[PDB]
Design a protein around this ligand. Structure first.
Ligand SMILES: Nc1ncnc2c1ncn2[C@@H]1O[C@H](COP(=O)(O)OP(=O)(O)OP(O)(O)=S)[C@@H](O)[C@H]1O
Ligand SMILES: Nc1ncnc2c1ncn2[C@@H]1O[C@H](COP(=O)(O)OP(=O)(O)OP(O)(O)=S)[C@@H](O)[C@H]1O
Ligand SMILES: Nc1ncnc2c1ncn2[C@@H]1O[C@H](COP(=O)(O)OP(=O)(O)OP(O)(O)=S)[C@@H](O)[C@H]1O
Ligand SMILES: Nc1ncnc2c1ncn2[C@@H]1O[C@H](COP(=O)(O)OP(=O)(O)OP(O)(O)=S)[C@@H](O)[C@H]1O
Ligand SMILES: [Mg+2]
Ligand SMILES: [Mg+2]
Ligand SMILES: [Mg+2]
Ligand SMILES: [Mg+2]
Lengths: 329, 257, 318, 486, 160, 251
C-alpha cells in the first residue's frame, strides 16, 4: 500500500544528502567544510520560499549524527507552540542536558522563527549563547524583519539565492531520468521563466503536464501543454494583445482583448504581469510615461486583488496603457 | 489479530498512571513474548520503557508482531470511563487499525466497546539497557520519594554522588542547601527496607527536579526502586512489576565548571 | 566527536583590559574595579558592542573566587515577574556574606528593557535600602524602556558604536592568534559589512576563513552578502527612475529578497535620511506606508515596488 | 560598619530639616501641619487652620523625582519624636493585605516606642504611629480606593508620597486629603551643598558649571550627586573645559505625558531648517512611541487650536488644517487596520507618521491657549451609554414597531415625543389617563420615559422643558403608574 | 433520497456528483481523473471567481476516490463554521493529519480505488489569519504520506 | 563556633510553630547561659520574645556570643523535612554566614544536613527590663484560646476589665470570670493579683495569633497595666515565651 511512489513530486524528490542540493553551491560548500573541520556555529538561513533551506538543514542533521536524525535533534516548526513559557522550559532543558544515544553536540532547529513573539526571541537571546559548547541553533526564516536585531546578530547569516537556470535545468534532467518522460527545449525555457525561482512550482506543473499526456511514455511535453496546465498566457497572444492595444483603436482593441481572454479562459491578473514584463524592456524617451504606466497598473492590480469587476478592469488596463503611451508623441 | 484479556481492570489504569503526565504519545509493540513500549518525552530528555509479559494477562493471543501507536491523553480518557470491576480486553484486527478496548463485567452483561484511532508514529525502535553501568543500587520507594520531594523545595537541581559505601543526594539552591547521606545496610526481619549498593567507580552527576518529581510518581506500582548510574550514560530508574518492569531513562545535566 | 567553540565564544574576553570598546567608560570601570566602590549602573547601546561581557568581567574581577555565591544574574530566560523580584531578589539582598573590605555583592539584571514596570517599582526600594551590601547593574539595549526612578538612582553609562579602528584592532588580534592568511581589502570589506558589530564581524570572519581560507574581497563579498540598508539607501537617491528600478531589480529582487523586507528597510532608511528636507521625507514615508499597506494584504509582486519607486521619484522630482 | 562603602547618597543625606535644599515653604507648611495635627484632632478635624490645613487628616507628597520627598517625610517624623511606619512598593499592597496588616496599626499604639525612652518628659506623641505610604503610583498587585478610604477613618498622621498627581488612577485622592507640591529646586539651593561636598572630597568644582549640572538633570539632585561621584574617580577637575561632554553624555530621557508630548510636537521650532537637524525625525517618532495610546487623540484634539509658523507661501491656515485632518483620517484607517484581525503590529511607525507627525508638522507654530484634554474618550463613553438605552428601547418596542434600532431613533422618537410629552403640556394632569394607554401598548415603563426624552437634539431640548411642568403632575404620574397593573 | 433531491433548489438539485458532469474546467478535471489510476495526488489549491465549481468538483473527486462509505470517515472539512484559529489549526488539524488511515472494507476496496491517504479540505482559506496559514506549512509538509491538503479560494493573494 | 544539640526535634518544631505567623524575621541571641530571641511584628504592634536555657539542650557549646538573624518561613520549610525521631543539632562557624541544621538518626545511618543563609537585620535589641504591672493573672491556656475564639467571631475589638478581682472579656459578647483556687486540680487554678482596676482594649488577629502558642503551656500568665503593653507568658520545660501587645486608643 504505502510506498515511495505515492508521495507527490514536491516531496518524493526531497534531497536526502547535501549532494542532491543544487543551486546554493556557495552555501553547501561552506556548510560541508564547517562539518568537516568540526566547527559549526549558530546558523541563520534566509531565503525565498522553496529554495532548499529545510532540505539542506535536514540533510545536514542526517550527515552529522546518522540515518536517524530525528532522535537527538530537536525541531520546533510553526506547528508547535513556541511561546515564552516554551522557550523557558523545553528549549532550556534540551540545551542544558546531554544526549541519550551518543556523545556529541546537540542540534536545535527553529524552523520559521519569524512567527515567534518578540518576548520569545528576547528570552532565547540569552539561552542561545549561555550554552554554546554543547548545543547549536539553526534559525530558518523567510522575512528577515520579524527577527529582533539581537537574535539576528548572534547567528551567522546565510542567504539562499533563488535557483538559477542551470540548477533547475539539472533538476529537471534528473527528474526526467527517473521518470520516463520527454520535455521540449522551448517548453523547458517557458518552465524556467514561469518558475520564478520556485522549485516547487516546477515539479507541480511538471506532474500536471505529465498527467495531461494520456500516455506519459512516448509523447513529449510541448510548450502548449505547459501553458495550458497553469493557464498562463502564451507570449504570442500576449504580444499580439499588447500590439493591438498600442496601435489599433478602442473598439477593435477591446474586441481582441475579449477574444484572447475568452479563447483559453485567461485571467486579467496574469495578463497584467505579462504585459508589464514585456513592456519593461521598451526604451521610453521620457520619465513621465513610466510613472503613470506603473502607478495606474499597480492600482488596477490592487483592485483586481479584491475582485470588483472583470471587464471594467480590462478596459481600465487598456485606458491606462493608452494614456501612458501618449506623452511620447 | 491480537487479543489480550487482563485478569483485572485497575491493573492497566495503575500501569498508565505511572507516566500519565510525563509522556504524551506512546507506541505499544505486541509480540508472542508480551507488550513492550518506549516513548520519548516532549523535550527529549527522558524515555519511558515498559515491558509486560504474558504473566499479568489472563489470556494472550498474538500471531504476528503488531505495532500500535496512540496518545496517552485519549487512552487515559478511555480508561477513566471504565468501571474498575470489569474485565479488560485489548483487541486488534489483522492490519493495525483503531484498537478496541472492551470492558465486560463478571456478573451482569455490560459490554463497553470503545475504539481508539491509532497515530502514525515513526517506528524508531530503540535498543538501550545493554550498556554496563558503573554503579547499581536499590532502595525503598518511600524513602526515595521523601528525599526527592524534600530536596525539590530548595532548588531545581539534585546532585547524586555514589562514593565508597555512601550515597549522597545534594540540593543546592538560593535559600539554602541540603545533603542526605545514606549507607548500605541489610536487615533480616525486614528484607524490603534494605538498601543495596554495588559500585565499581565513584559517580557524581546532576539531574533536574521536575523530571525526578515526575519519575517518582511511579512509586505507586512497586516498593523497591532500582537506580543504575554511569558516567556518559542515562540514569536508569527501574520499578519492578509482578510481570514486567517500568524503567525511566533520565539524561544527566552537565556542569559548566 | 568534539565540537570546537566558536570564535565569538572561544575568544570572549575574560579580562577587562581586553575590551576594545569606548575607552573612557572602560577606563572608568577599570578604576572602579581596582578600587571596589562600584555604584549602580545602567549600560545601554547598540546590539553587539560588549556590554554584557564588560559587566561580567567587572563582576569576575571584583569578586574573584566569590563569583559563585556573590553574583545573582537574572536573564530573560529566567523568570523576572513581580513574584521573583519580590522574593528571590530580596532574599539575596539580605544574604549575609563576608566579602573583602572594599567589595560588594552584585546583581546582574541583563536585558532590563524586557521587565515589567511593576518589577522595577518593587525593585526601587529593595535596591535603595541595602546599598551597603548590594550594587545592582542593569544592561539593556533601549534605555527609554526603563522607568524613571530606577534609571535615576543608578549612574548612567552610555555606550557608542565601535569605530572601525577598534574593530580592525580586534580583527588583527584574532588573525594573529589564529594564524590566518589575509589581505587588507578583505579586512576593510569585513569592517564595512559589519556595520559596527563585533559579534557579526567575528562570525563573518570565521565563516569566510573556514569557507575559503584566504580573506580577500572576493570571498567576503561572495559569502557575506554586503548589508541591506545601504543598497536601499542607494536606490532611493537615484537621479532617474530607470536607474533606481534597475537597482531594485538586480540588487534586491533578483538576489531573493522578500517585498515586505524591502519595504520595511526603505521605510527605516527614509526615517534617517538627513540629506533631503522634512516635507519630502514625510511624503516619501507616506507613500512607502501606502505601499506597505498594499503589501500586507497579500499582493506583494514586483509591480508594487516599481510603482512605489515611481511615486517617490514623482514626489522628489517636483 | 563602614564609611567609604556608602553610596555617596546616604552619607550625605540630610540629617536635619535645615539641610533640605529647596522648597522651604512646602516643608515648613508640612511641618506646621504635622505639629498641629494633634490640636486639629482635638477639634475632630472640623476647624480649618490659618492655611486651611487642619481639616485634612492625611498628607500627600507629589513632585518630580529626586527632590527629597521621602527624606523630608522621614525627617519631619523623626524631629517631632514620632515613630515611623513605612510601607513601599516592594511590600504587597492590596485591599485584603492592606486591611489585614496596616489596618490594625491605624488606631493602635507603638510597642517599640514604649521601650525607647520614657523616663524624661520629651513629648506626649512619642508612642504614636506615622504611616508613610511611599510610591503610591505602583499598584500593579485596592491600591488607590482602599488607601483613599483610609484617609477618612484614620486616627494617626498619614503621609502619602507619589511622583505624578494628575494620573487618572489616583484621582480619589483629590479632596479627601491635603496635598502639597514639591518643585524642582533652583541652582542656588544645592550650590552650597555641592561646594561643601567638593571641599570635603579634594576635587575641584567651578561655581559656574553647577548651573549647567542642574540644567542637564532637571530636578534630580541625587542624579547630580551620582554624576559627580562617578566622574570624580578619574577626573578631579570639572570646569568649563569638559562640561559639554558631561552634559551631552548624561542627559535624562524622561517619558513625556499627553500634555507635554502635544506641546512639544506642536511647537514650530523643531520643524524649522535649524531645528530639523537638532531634533531629527527619528526622535519625533520616538516621541510618539513613548505613548501610542493618547498621542493621536491629543493631536486630533488640539491640532487646529494653534497659530502656525511653517505656513508655505500662498497656503492659509484653513488649507493646512484640511491637510492635517486628511492625514488624521489616513492615520485612523491605519490604526483600524492595526487593531483589527491578523494583529498587524509591524505597521505602527506608519501610524506614528500619519496620525501624529504629519498633521503636527503641517500646523506647527505657537500654541495660543493651553493644552486641552482629549474629548473623544468621554464622547465614546456617552455614545455607548446612549446606544445601550436605545437598544433597550428598541427591544422593548420590537413587538409593535417592526423596525431596526437605527430607523427608530431617526424617525419614531420625534412622533413619540408629540404623543407622550405634549399632552402633559397642553392638557396638564388630566392627560395622565391618555399617555399611559400609549406606553402599555409598547411595554414601556417610567425608566423608558426617562430615557426617551434625553435623545432629542437641536431645537427640541427636553432636559429644560421637563423642569417647566409642575412638580405635582410629576409626583402624580409615578403614583398612577405604580398603582395600576399592566 | 430521490424525494430529498427533488425537494431542494436547482442549485443543489443538479450539483455534479462525478468528475464527468463538471463541464467547465477541462484542464483541472483531466489531472484529477488521471490521479485516480495513479496515487500521487499533490496538495491542491483551487482558486477562481465565485460560483465556478471548486467546492462541487472536490466533493465529486472525493466521492469517486473513496466512495459513499469511506468518505465520511476518511476526510476532514473546515469550511467556514468551525473555529479556524491558530490553536485549532495547531491541535485538531495536526491530530487528524498525523493519524492512521482507516481500514478500507472489502466492498470499498473492490469497487473504488482507495489510496493510502486521507483528505483535509480547508474551504475558503482566504478567511484564515496569517498565523494559522504559517502554522499549516510544516503540518502539511511532514505528514505528506498519510494526508493531502486541498485549499479553495477566490483570491490567491490572500493566501500567504 | 556554636554547637547545640537537642534530645528531640519536636520541641524546637513546636517552638517555631508557636509564632511563625506573627513575624517573618528573628534575631536569635546566643550567650553562654542560653538562647534568647525577640522579633517585632511587621506592623510594630506585637513583639514575641523567648528564652531557652541549657536544660533543654542535650549538649551546648558557645565560645563567644553570636547573633543569628534568620527568616522563619524558610526555617519552617527546612524544619518540615525533619522527623520527630531525629536528634537536631545547630552548628555555626565564626562569622556565621550560614547555619547548619543537622538531623541524626539513632537507630539508622541517615544523617541529613541543611544549610540556611542568614539575613542582615538591624539588631536594635531593646531591653525587657521589668516594669511593675498592675494586674497579674494566671489562667489555663486552652480556656483562654476558646474564649477568644468565641469573642473574635463577633467583632475585632476586645475589651479586658480587671475590676474587684473580677475578669471581664467583652466583645463589641461578654464572658465574666471569678478567681477560684482549688487544691484538687492546680492546672485550673485561675490566680489573680490586682492593684488597681485595669481597663484595656486589644485587636482580634493579635490575640488569634498569640493563642496559636497555647500548645507549649497548659497555663498562661497575663499581665496588664493601664499605660503599658499587655504581657502573655507561656512557660517551657527550660525557658519561657512571652508576647507584648500594644494597647488601643481610648474613645
Ligand atoms: N536546492 C534544491 N535542490 C533540489 N530540490 C530542491 C531544492 N530546493 C527545493 N527543492 C525541492 O523543493 C522541496 C521543498 O523544499 P524545501 O527546502 O522544503 O523548501 P523550504 O526551503 O523549506 O522553503 P519554505 O519552508 O517553503 S519558506 C524539496 O523536497 C525538493 O523537491
Ligand atoms: N569591545 C570588545 N572587545 C572585544 N570583543 C568584544 C567587544 N565587544 C564585543 N565583543 C565580542 O562580542 C561577544 C560578547 O558580546 P556581548 O557582550 O554579548 O554583546 P552585548 O553588549 O551584550 O550586546 P547584546 O547583549 O548581544 S544586545 C564576544 O564574542 C566578544 O569577544
Ligand atoms: N534638597 C535636598 N538637599 C540635599 N539632598 C537632597 C535633597 N533632595 C534630595 N537629596 C538627596 O537625595 C537622596 C534622597 O532621595 P529622595 O529625593 O528622597 O527620593 P524621592 O524624593 O523619594 O524620589 P523618588 O522616591 O526616587 S520618585 C539623598 O541622597 C539626599 O541627600
Ligand atoms: N463547473 C460546473 N459544472 C456544473 N455545474 C456547476 C459548475 N460550477 C457550478 N455549477 C453549479 O452551480 C452550483 C454551485 O457550485 P459550487 O461549486 O458549489 O460554487 P463554488 O465554486 O463553491 O463558488 P464559491 O463557494 O462561492 S467559491 C453547483 O451545485 C452546480 O449546480
Ligand atoms: Mg522551511
Ligand atoms: Mg549581552
Ligand atoms: Mg521615595
Ligand atoms: Mg466554494
Amino acid at each position: 500500500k504505502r510506498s515511495k511512489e505515492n508521495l507527490p513530486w514536491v516531496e518524493k524528490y526531497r534531497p536526502e544528502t547535501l549532494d542532491e542540493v543544487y543551486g546554493q553551491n556557495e552555501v553547501i560548500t561552506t556548510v560541508r567544510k564547517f562539518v568537516d573541520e568540526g566547527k559549526l556555529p549558530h546558523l541563520l538561513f534566509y531565503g525565498p520560499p522553496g529554495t532548499g533551506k529545510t532540505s539542506t538543514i535536514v540533510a545536514l542533521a542526517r550527515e552529522i549524527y546518522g540515518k536517524n536524525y530525528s532522535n537527538m535533534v530537536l525541531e520546533l516548526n510553526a506547528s508547535d507552540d513556541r511561546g515564552i513559557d516554551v522557550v523557558r522550559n523545553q528549549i532550556k532543558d534540551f540545551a542544558s542536558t546531554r544526549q541519550i544515544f551518543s556523545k556529541g553536540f546537540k542540534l536545535i532547529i527553529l524552523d520559521e522563527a519569524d512567527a515567534m513573539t518578540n518576548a520569545a526571541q528576547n528570552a532565547l537571546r540569552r539561552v542561545i549563547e549561555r550554552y554554546t559548547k554543547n548545543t547549536r541553533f539553526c534559525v530558518l526564516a523567510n522575512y528577515a524583519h520579524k527577527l529582533t536585531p539581537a537574535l539576528l546578530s548572534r547567528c551567522t547569516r546565510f542567504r539562499f539565492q533563488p535557483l538559477p537556470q542551470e540548477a533547475i535545468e539539472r533538476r529537471i534532467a534528473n527528474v526526467l531520468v527517473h521518470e520516463k518522460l520527454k520535455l521540449s527545449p522551448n517548453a523547458e525555457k517557458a518552465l524556467i521563466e514561469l518558475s520564478n525561482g520556485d522549485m516547487r512550482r516546477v515539479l507541480n506543473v511538471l506532474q500536471s503536464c505529465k498527467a495531461t499526456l494520456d500516455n506519459p511514455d512516448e509523447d513529449e511535453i510541448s510548450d502548449d501543454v505547459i501553458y495550458e496546465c497553469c493557464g498562463a498566457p502564451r507570449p504570442s497572444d500576449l504580444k499580439a494583445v499588447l500590439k493591438s492595444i498600442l496601435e489599433d483603436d478602442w473598439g477593435t482593441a477591446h474586441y481582441t482583448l475579449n477574444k484572447v481572454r475568452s479563447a483559453k479562459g485567461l485571467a486579467l491578473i496574469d495578463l497584467i504581469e505579462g504585459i508589464v514584463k514585456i513592456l519593461e524592456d521598451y526604451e521610453l524617451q521620457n520619465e513621465e510615461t513610466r510613472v503613470h504606466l506603473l502607478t495606474k497598473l499597480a492600482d488596477i492590480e490592487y483592485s483586481i486583488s479584491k475582485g470588483g469587476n472583470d471587464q471594467i478592469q480590462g478596459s481600465a488596463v487598456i485606458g491606462a496603457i493608452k494614456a501612458s503611451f501618449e506623452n511620447e508623441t | 489479530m491480537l487479543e489480550a484479556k487482563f485478569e483485572e481492570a485497575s491493573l492497566f489504569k495503575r500501569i498508565i498512571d505511572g507516566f500519565k503526565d510525563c509522556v504524551q504519545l506512546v507506541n505499544f509493540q505486541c509480540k508472542e513474548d508480551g507488550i513492550i513500549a518506549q516513548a520519548v518525552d516532549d523535550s527529549r530528555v527522558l524515555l519511558v520503557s515498559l515491558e509486560i509479559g504474558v504473566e499479568a494477562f489472563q489470556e494472550y493471543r498474538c500471531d504476528h508482531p503488531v505495532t500500535l501507536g496512540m496518545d496517552l491523553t485519549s487512552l487515559s480518557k478511555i480508561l477513566r470511563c471504565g468501571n474498575n470491576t470489569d474485565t479488560l480486553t485489548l483487541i486488534a484486527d489483522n492490519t493495525p487499525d483503531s484498537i478496541i478496548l472492551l470492558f465486560e463485567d463478571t456478573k451482569k452483561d455490560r459490554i463497553a466497546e470503545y475504539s481508539l484511532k491509532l497515530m502514525d508514529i515513526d517506528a524508531d525502535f530503540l535498543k538501550i539497557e545493554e550498556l554496563q553501568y558503573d554503579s547499581t543500587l536499590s532502595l525503598p520507594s518511600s524513602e526515595f520519594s521523601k528525599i526527592v520531594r524534600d530536596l525539590s523545595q530548595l532548588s531545581d537541581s539534585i546532585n547524586i554522588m555514589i562514593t565508597k559505601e555512601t550515597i549522597k543526594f545534594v540540593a543546592d539552591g538560593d535559600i539554602g542547601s541540603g545533603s542526605v547521606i545514606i549507607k548500605p545496610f541489610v536487615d533480616m526481619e525486614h528484607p524490603e527496607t534494605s538498601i543495596k549498593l554495588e559500585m565499581d567507580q565513584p559517580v557524581d552527576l546532576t539531574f533536574g527536579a521536575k523530571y525526578l518529581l515526575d519519575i517518582i510518581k511511579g512509586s505507586s506500582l512497586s516498593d523497591r526502586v532500582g537506580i543504575r548510574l554511569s558516567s556518559e550514560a542515562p540514569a536508569l530508574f527501574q520499578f519492578d512489576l509482578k510481570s514486567g518492569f517500568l524503567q525511566f531513562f533520565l539524561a544527566p545535566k552537565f556542569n559548566d565548571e | 566527536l568534539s565540537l570546537q567553540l566558536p570564535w565569538v565564544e572561544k575568544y570572549r574576553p575574560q579580562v577587562l583590559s581586553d575590551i576594545v570598546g569606548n575607552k573612557e567608560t572602560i577606563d572608568r570601570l577599570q578604576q572602579i574595579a581596582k578600587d571596589g566602590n562600584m555604584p549602580h549602573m545602567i549600560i545601554s547601546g547598540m546590539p553587539g558592542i560588549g556590554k554584557t561581557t564588560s559587566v561580567h568581567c567587572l563582576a569576575h574581577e571584583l569578586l574573584g573566587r566569590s563569583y559563585a555565591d556573590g553574583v545573582l544574574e537574572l536573564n530573560a530566560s529566567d523568570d523576572r515577574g513581580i513574584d521573583v523580584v519580590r522574593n528571590q531578589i530580596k532574599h539575596f539582598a539580605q544574604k549575609k556574606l563576608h566579602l573583602p573590605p572594599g567589595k560588594h555583592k552584585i546583581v546582574i539584571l541583563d536585558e532590563a528593557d524586557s521587565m515589567t514596570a511593576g518589577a522595577q517599582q518593587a525593585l526601587r526600594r529593595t535596591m535603595e535600602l541595602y546599598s551597603n551590601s548590594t550594587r545592582f547593574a542593569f544592561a539593556c539595549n533601549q534605555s527609554n524602556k526603563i522607568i524613571e526612578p530606577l534609571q535615576s538612582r543608578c549612574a548612567i553609562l552610555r555606550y557608542s558604536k565601535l569605530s572601525d579602528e577598534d574593530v580592525l584592532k580586534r580583527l588583527l588580534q584574532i588573525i594573529k592568534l589564529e594564524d590566518v592568511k589575509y589581505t587588507n581589502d578583505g579586512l576593510e570589506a569585513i569592517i564595512f559589512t559589519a556595520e559596527g558589530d563585533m559579534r557579526q564581524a567575528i562570525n563573518n570572519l570565521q565563516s569566510t576563513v573556514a569557507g575559503h581560507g584566504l580573506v580577500n574581497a572576493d570571498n567576503v563579498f561572495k559569502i557575506v552578502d554586503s548589508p541591506h540598508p545601504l543598497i536601499v539607501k542607494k536606490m532611493l537617491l537615484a537621479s532617474n527612475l530607470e536607474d533606481s528600478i534597475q537597482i531594485l531589480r538586480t540588487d534586491l529582487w533578483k538576489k531573493g529578497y522578500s517585498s515586505i523586507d524591502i519595504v520595511t528597510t526603505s521605510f527605516r532608511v527614509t526615517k534617517n535620511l538627513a540629506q533631503v528636507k522634512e516635507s519630502v521625507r514625510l511624503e516619501m514615508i507616506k507613500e512607502i506606508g501606502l505601499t506597505h499597506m498594499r503589501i500586507l494584504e497579500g499582493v506583494g509582486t514586483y509591480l508594487q515596488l516599481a510603482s512605489m519607486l515611481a511615486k517617490i521619484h514623482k514626489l522628489n522630482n517636483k | 560598619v563602614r564609611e567609604e562603602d556608602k553610596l555617596w547618597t546616604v552619607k550625605y543625606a540630610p540629617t536635619n530639616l535645615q539641610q533640605v535644599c529647596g522648597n522651604k515653604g512646602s516643608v515648613m507648611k508640612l511641618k506646621n501641619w504635622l505639629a498641629n495635627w494633634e490640636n486639629s484632632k482635638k477639634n475632630s478635624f472640623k476647624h480649618a487652620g490659618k492655611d486651611g490645613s487642619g481639616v485634612f487628616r492625611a498628607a500627600m507628597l507629589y513632585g518630580p523625582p529626586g527632590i527629597g520627598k521621602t527624606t523630608a517625610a522621614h525627617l519631619v517624623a523623626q524631629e517631632l519624636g514620632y515613630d515611623i511606619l513605612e510601607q513601599n512598593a516592594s511590600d504587597v499592597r492590596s485591599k485584603t493585605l492592606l486591611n489585614a496588616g496596616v489596618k490594625n496599626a491605624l488606631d493602635n499604639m507603638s510597642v517599640v516606642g514604649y521601650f525607647k525612652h520614657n523616663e524624661e518628659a520629651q513629648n506626649l506623641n512619642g508612642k504614636h504611629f506615622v504611616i508613610i505610604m511611599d510610591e503610591v503610583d505602583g499598584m500593579s498587585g485596592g491600591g488607590v480606593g482602599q488607601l483613599a478610604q483610609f484617609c477618612r477613618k484614620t486616627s494617626t498622621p498619614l503621609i502619602l508620597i507619589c511622583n505624578e498627581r494628575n494620573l487618572p488612577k489616583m484621582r480619589p485622592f483629590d479632596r479627601v486629603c491635603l496635598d502639597i507640591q514639591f518643585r524642582r529646586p533652583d541652582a542656588n539651593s544645592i550650590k552650597s551643598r555641592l561646594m561643601t561636598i567638593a571641599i570635603r572630597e579634594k576635587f575641584k568644582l567651578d561655581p559656574n558649571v553647577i548651573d549647567r549640572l542642574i540644567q542637564t538633570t532637571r530636578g534630580d539632585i541625587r542624579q547630580v550627586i551620582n554624576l559627580l561621584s562617578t566622574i570624580s574617580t578619574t577626573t578631579k577637575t570639572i570646569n568649563h573645559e569638559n562640561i559639554n561632554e558631561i552634559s551631552k553624555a548624561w542627559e535624562k530621557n524622561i517619558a513625556l505625558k499627553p500634555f507635554d508630548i502635544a506641546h512639544k510636537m506642536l511647537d514650530g521650532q523643531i520643524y524649522s531648517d535649524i531645528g530639523s537637524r537638532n531634533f531629527t525625525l527619528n526622535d519625533k517618532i520616538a516621541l510618539y512611541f513613548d505613548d501610542f495610546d493618547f498621542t493621536p487623540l491629543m493631536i486630533q484634539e488640539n491640532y487646529l487650536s494653534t497659530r502656525p509658523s511653517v505656513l508655505k507661501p500662498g497656503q492659509s491656515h484653513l488649507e493646512a488644517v484640511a491637510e492635517a485632518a486628511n492625514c488624521i483620517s489616513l492615520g485612523d484607517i491605519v490604526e483600524k487596520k492595526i487593531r483589527s484581525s491578523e494583529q498587524l503590529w509591524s505597521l505602527l511607525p506608519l501610524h506614528a507618521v500619519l496620525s501624529s507627525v504629519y498633521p503636527a508638522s503641517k500646523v506647527a507654530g505657537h500654541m495660543a491657549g493651553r493644552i486641552n484634554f482629549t474629548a473623544w474618550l468621554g464622547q465614546n463613553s456617552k455614545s455607548a451609554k446612549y446606544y445601550r438605552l436605545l437598544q433597550e428601547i428598541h427591544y422593548h418596542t420590537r413587538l409593535g414597531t417592526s423596525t431596526d434600532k437605527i430607523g427608530l431613533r431617526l424617525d419614531y422618537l420625534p412622533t413619540f415625543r408629540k404623543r407622550l410629552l405634549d399632552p402633559f403640556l397642553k392638557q396638564g394632569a388630566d392627560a395622565i389617563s391618555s399617555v399611559i394607554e400609549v406606553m402599555d401598548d409598547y411595554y414601556l415603563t417610567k425608566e423608558d420615559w426617562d430615557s426617551i426624552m434625553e435623545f432629542f437634539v437641536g431645537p427640541d431640548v427636553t432636559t429644560a422643558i421637563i423642569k417647566k411642568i409642575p412638580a405635582t403632575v410629576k409626583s402624580g404620574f409615578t403614583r398612577k403608574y405604580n398603582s395600576m397593573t399592566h | 433520497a430521490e424525494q430529498s433531491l427533488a425537494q431542494q433548489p436547482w442549485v443543489e438539485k443538479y450539483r455534479p456528483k462525478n468528475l464527468d458532469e463538471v463541464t467547465a474546467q477541462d484542464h483541472a478535471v483531466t489531472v484529477l481523473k488521471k490521479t485516480l489510476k495513479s496515487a500521487n495526488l499533490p496538495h491542491m489549491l483551487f482558486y477562481g471567481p465565485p460560483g465556478t465549481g471548486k467546492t462541487s468538483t472536490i466533493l465529486a473527486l472525493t466521492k469517486e476516490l473513496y466512495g459513499p462509505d469511506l468518505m465520511k470517515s476518511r476526510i476532514l472539512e473546515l469550511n467556514a463554521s468551525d473555529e479556524r484559529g491558530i490553536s485549532i489549526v495547531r491541535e485538531k488539524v495536526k491530530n487528524f493529519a498525523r493519524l492512521t488511515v482507516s481500514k478500507p472494507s472489502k466492498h470499498d476496496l473492490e469497487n473504488y480505488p482507495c489510496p493510502p491517504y486521507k483528505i483535509i479540505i480547508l474551504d475558503e482559506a482566504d478567511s484564515m489569519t496569517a498565523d494559522a496559514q504559517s502554522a499549516l506549512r510544516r503540518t502539511m509538509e511532514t505528514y505528506s504520506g498519510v494526508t493531502r491538503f486541498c485549499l479553495i479560494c477566490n483570491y490567491v493573494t490572500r493566501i500567504i
